[PDB]
């Protein structure tokens, strides 16, 4: 399948070269998989989600996304126009309030929730979790991310936006999950992207167009935007049967475009997520 005039990041995911604008992908499009977006919520009524999004948990007085960030991330995973995996099921877990803030205790509870709740959901092709959040190092936060991964969920986490080594951030620094840095449309490391040996992969993160609250769209930047590209890619590849939740981060790294990014510090992987689709 081909989506013309796609956002640059989707085109980049499906290309061996920068500078193209069509997204190419197998039409299965993640059908039968499910992706949990653990964030500020998802505006499930947005036309871009086509009924495939649903809030399943909140830790606040409402399940509504009053911020926009969670809706944007969910759109990059799975919206019809802005999403990698256009037929996946999206499940919202609101661990961040409408100012984008949340306690680590709440974030941990949300991760434990997904590890159990997946067993109440029909996801025959596999389960992914996208965590576009983090803060300073916490052993408890890393352990919760490691538990979620071990339960059979492909966990993708943002490296962080401090232009610093991600070893000092959580859940970015947990070795067993998939830690995602950000690149721009000229194949440069994004100016804010964290780096370091803990990173597993880069995805598009600068100037990413996706869904927003109020039935709208906008472009924003962050490792928070690169993470759902990788999460959606994992759901897409799992639906194709190419990999599993336990192996998808390694598979994405094995099949990535290698050596194409600039301003990668010595010691950080030079790997850009790629779907390897040939029509």
Binding site for ligand AMH (CB under 6 A): 118-119, 121-124, 127, 152
Q: For residues 75 and 95, give the distance between their C-alpha atoms in angstroms, rounded to a whole number.
A: 18
H or E element, residue 254: helix 248-254
- Cβ distance to ligand AMH smaller for residue 235 or 273: 235
- Cβ distance to ligand AMH smaller for residue 57 or 69: 57
- Cβ distance to ligand AMH smaller for residue 88 or 221: 88
126 in the Ramachandran plot: left (φ > 0), alpha (ψ -120 to 50) or beta?
left
Q: Which two tokens stand for residue 248?
A: 């998808």
**177 marked as binding residue:** yes
Q: Let me know if 97 is a catalytic residue.
A: no
Go through the chain and tell me how many residues it has: 279
Q: Let me know if 224 is a catalytic residue.
A: yes
Alpha helices (runs of H) in 51-103, residue ranges in sequence order: 69-78
- Cβ distance to ligand AMH smaller for residue 110 or 203: 110
Q: Let me know if 210 is a catalytic residue.
A: no
Smallest distance from the beta carbon of 123 to ligand AMH, in angstroms?
A: 4
Smallest distance from the beta carbon of 228 to ligand AMH, in angstroms?
A: 20
Closest CA to 261 of 187, 180, 195, 207: 187
**165 marked as binding residue:** no
Smallest distance from the beta carbon of 52 to ligand AMH, in angstroms?
A: 16
**260 marked as binding residue:** yes
Partner residues linked to 156 by β-bridges = 130, 178
**198 marked as binding residue:** no
Q: Which of 33, 46, 65, 69 is catalytic?
A: 69
**175 marked as binding residue:** yes
Q: Which of 33, 39, 98, 132 is catalytic?
A: 39
Q: For residues 159 and 167, give the distance between their C-alpha atoms in angstroms, rounded to a whole number.
A: 9
Burial category of 269 from C-beta neighbours within 10 Å (exposed 0-12, middle 13-18, buried 19 and up): buried
Residues that constitute the known binding site: 16, 175, 177, 200, 260
Q: Which residues have a catalytic role annotated?
A: 39, 69, 224
Residues that constitute the known binding site for Ca(2+): 16, 175, 177, 200, 260
């Amino acid at each position: 399948a081909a989506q013309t005039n796609a956002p640059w990041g989707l085109a980049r995911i499906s290309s061996t070269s920068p500078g193209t604008s069509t997204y190419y992908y197998d039409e299965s499009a993640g059908q039968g998989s499910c992706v949990y977006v653990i964030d500020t919520g998802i505006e499930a009524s947005h036309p871009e989600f086509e009924g495939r999004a649903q809030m399943v948990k909140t830790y606040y007085y409402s399940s509504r996304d009053g911020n926009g960030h969670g809706t944007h991330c969910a759109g990059t995973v799975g919206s019809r126009t802005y999403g990698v995996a256009k037929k996946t099921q999206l499940f919202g877990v609101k661990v961040l309030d409408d100012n984008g803030s949340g306690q680590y205790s709440t974030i941990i509870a949300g991760m434990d929730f997904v590890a159990s709740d997946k067993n109440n959901r029909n996801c025959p092709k596999g389960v992914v979790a996208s965590l576009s959040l983090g803060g300073g190092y916490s052993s408890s936060v890393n352990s919760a991310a490691a538990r979620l991964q071990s339960s059979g969920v492909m966990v993708a986490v943002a490296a962080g936006n401090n232009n610093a080594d991600a070893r000092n951030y959580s859940p970015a620094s947990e070795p067993s999950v998939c830690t995602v840095g950000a690149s721009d449309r000229y194949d440069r490391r994004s100016s804010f992207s964290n780096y370091g040996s803990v990173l597993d992969i880069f995805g598009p993160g600068t100037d990413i167009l996706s869904t927003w609250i109020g039935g709208s769209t906008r472009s924003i930047s962050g490792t928070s935007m690169a993470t759902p590209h990788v999460a959606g890619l994992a759901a897409y590849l799992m639906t194709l049967g190419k990999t599993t939740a336990a192996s998808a981060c390694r598979y994405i790294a094995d099949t990535a475009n290698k050596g194409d990014l600039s301003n990668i510090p010595f010691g950080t992987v030079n790997l850009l997520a790629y779907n390897n689709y040939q029509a």
